[PDB]
Amino acid sequence: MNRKVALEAVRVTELAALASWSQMGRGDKIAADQAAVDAMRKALNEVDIDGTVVIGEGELDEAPMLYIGEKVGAGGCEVDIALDPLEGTTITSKGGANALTVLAMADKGGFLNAPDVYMQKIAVGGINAPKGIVDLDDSVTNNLKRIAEFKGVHMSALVVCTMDRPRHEHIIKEARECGARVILINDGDVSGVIATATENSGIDVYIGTGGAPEGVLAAAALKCLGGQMQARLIFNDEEEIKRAHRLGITDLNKKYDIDDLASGDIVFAATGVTDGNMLQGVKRVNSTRRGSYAVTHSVVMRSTTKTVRHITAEHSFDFKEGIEKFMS
């Protein structure tokens, strides 16, 4: 995987973010999603890779663009592509927190090719955090006690993050019972997991159930940032089992370690759409010095080197024109 591919990925997430931002607060999640898919597909076909989508918008049946197996790129090293054109379609449509655009790449087979099913998740940051510090079969109490001890703080100092859903009431009750602070996000458990390893996020642990593709994407970032995560797929009906079987997943009760979700040489890239726990959103900026531009905030990271790059980009634009000129 050529060093060139890493920094090229940020252009993809930036262009998807700008397209998504033009639909921010338009009340239309489908238009938000399609703006991102279109921008990302077009940008990805300029990237010098021999790319196969292993996580994307869906099966070819249901998704015309960025479907599983689709071939993308202008030609280059062979890579598996995990992508999320718009993490937070509903978020973006109402301008909520934590919307992102996300692109990750691995050598062939480096990702768990996750089906569209739910996934139990537990994640903690820290480059020195050991394997086994968290696991999903241990109680919440016992996981937090270990985390607090490793971080060297009282339990009440820890900030635990989960989604505000009925399915999480027991995580929340238990975490609070042993003394921790638990904050709720409305959506965007990609940002919420990655935040555990993000300097100054204010989030120490993530515990929740959400999308499985999102779990792999977040593991890909934690692999570069440092941290630990365990995940397990959930299967509620026979169609979900069939989706897994079609992707080669047959050990349904497997507990996945972070190395099982994303392994080898991983590149992770993301751009903020709205302000979130991980990344700032797109903003309109005026200046006499340079004129008006849209500013994006992005991150690109690589697991092998552990180089993490924070990128602020200034994109020239006349806001006298319609904002949908940021589409494609």
Which residues are documented as binding site for substrate?
Answer: 87-89, 118, 165-167, 187-189, 211
Would you count residue 86 as binding Mn ion (CB under 5 A)?
A: yes
Q: SS in 3 state form for 38-58?
A: HHHHHHHCCCCEEEEEEECCE
Would you count residue 97 as binding its own copies (CB under 8 A)?
A: yes
Contact 40, 28 (CB under 8 A): no
| Residue 294 CB neighbour total at 10 angstroms | 21
Q: How far is the CB of 17 from Mn ion (least distance, A)?
A: 12
Contacted by 110, from Mn ion, its own copies, none: CB < 5 to 8 Å by type: none
Query: Using CB under 8 A, which residues numbered 28 to 67 contact its own copies?
Result: 46-48
Closer residue to Mn ion (CB): 91 or 222: 91
Query: Using CB under 8 A, which residues numbered 220 to 259 contact its own copies?
Result: 225-226
Cα 37 to Cα 43, 76, 88, 193, 261, distances in angstroms = 10, 22, 13, 23, 24
Would you count residue 130 as binding its own copies (CB under 8 A)?
A: no
Half-sphere exposure (Cβ direction) of 123: Cα atoms closer than 13 Å: 39
Query: Using CB under 8 A, which residues numbered 295 to 314 contact its own copies?
Result: 305-314
Summarize the annotated binding site for Mn(2+) as residue ranges.
33, 57, 84, 87, 214
Query: Using CB under 8 A, which residues numbered 277 to 296 contact its own copies?
Result: 277, 281-291, 293
Would you count residue 103 as binding Mn ion (CB under 5 A)?
A: no
Would you count residue 322 as binding its own copies (CB under 8 A)?
A: yes
Contacted by 84, from Mn ion, its own copies, none: CB < 5 to 8 Å by type: Mn ion
Query: Using CB under 8 A, which residues numbered 133 to 152 contact its own copies?
Result: 151-152
Residue 198 DSSP one-character state:
S
Would you count residue 166 as binding its own copies (CB under 8 A)?
A: no
Cα 228 to Cα 121, 129, 221, 284, distances in angstroms = 11, 7, 11, 36
Q: How far is the CB of 213 from Mn ion (least distance, A)?
A: 8
Cα 319 to Cα 36, 39, 324, distances in angstroms = 20, 20, 10
Q: How far is the CB of 270 from its own copies (least distance, A)?
A: 15
Would you count residue 84 as binding Mn ion (CB under 5 A)?
A: yes
Would you count residue 77 as binding its own copies (CB under 8 A)?
A: no
Q: How far is the CB of 101 from Mn ion (least distance, A)?
A: 9
Residues 255, 88, 272: CA angle, nearest 5 degrees? 100
Summarize the annotated binding site as residue ranges.
33, 57, 84, 87-89, 118, 165-167, 187-189, 211, 214
Identity of the residue numbered 119: M
Q: Which DSSP helix (H) or strand (E) runs through 130? A: none
In the list 75, 127, 237, 250, the residue contacting its own copies (rule: CB under 8 A) is: 127
Rounded-to-integer distance, Cα 199 and Cα 19, Å = 28
Only one of the segments 54-62, 110-118, 160-168, 262-270 lies at the binding site for its own copies (rule: CB under 8 A); that segment is 160-168
**Gap between the terminal Cα atoms of the chain:** 27
